[PDB]
Amino acid sequence: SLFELGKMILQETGKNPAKSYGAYGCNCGVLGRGKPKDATDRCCYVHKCCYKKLTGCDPKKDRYSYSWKDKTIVCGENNPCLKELCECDKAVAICLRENLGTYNKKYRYHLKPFCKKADPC
């Protein structure tokens, strides 16, 4: 759910997730994709495409288990959908941390109404 996802982004990046990524560019935040504005935004574009494989679980509401071991996110077994959900969330948290070097506050509440329509995943 958003709780695990938010916690992973905070563990990897050290940033408040909602403030930094709740509404960044064309893909981080409220729903839908759009052409990405930069590398951070493209992490979120990839994360929303990753959610498309899920069947039987809901990425916003469903909780799942994971732990922090040797400063690494480790998804627990869960069930098949929840395990895929946990790995989609872990990958976006890692990708946001890898791209913090180009993060641009000017994209923070970017105007989603103006985003180019996203290509198919």
Swiss-Prot record:
Changing residue 35 to A: No change in myotoxicity when injected into mice. No change in myoblast membrane permeabilizing activities. No change in bactericidal activity. Decrease in calcium-independent damaging activity against EYPC:DPPG liposomes. SMART domains: PA2c. Disulfide bonds join 26-115, 28-44, 43-95, 49-121, 50-88, 57-81, 75-86. Suramin inhibits both myotoxic and muscle-paralyzing activities. Chicoric acid inhibits myotoxic activity. Zinc ions inhibits the myotoxic activity and the neuromuscular blockade. Heparin inhibits myotoxic activity. Changing residue 36 to A: Important decrease in myotoxicity when injected into mice. Decrease in membrane permeabilization of cultured myoblasts. No change in bactericidal activity. No change in calcium-independent damaging activity against EYPC:DPPG liposomes. It holds the Pfam family Phospholip_A2_1. PANTHER family: PHOSPHOLIPASE A2 FAMILY MEMBER, PHOSPHOLIPASE A2, MEMBRANE ASSOCIATED. This is Basic phospholipase A2 homolog bothropstoxin-I.
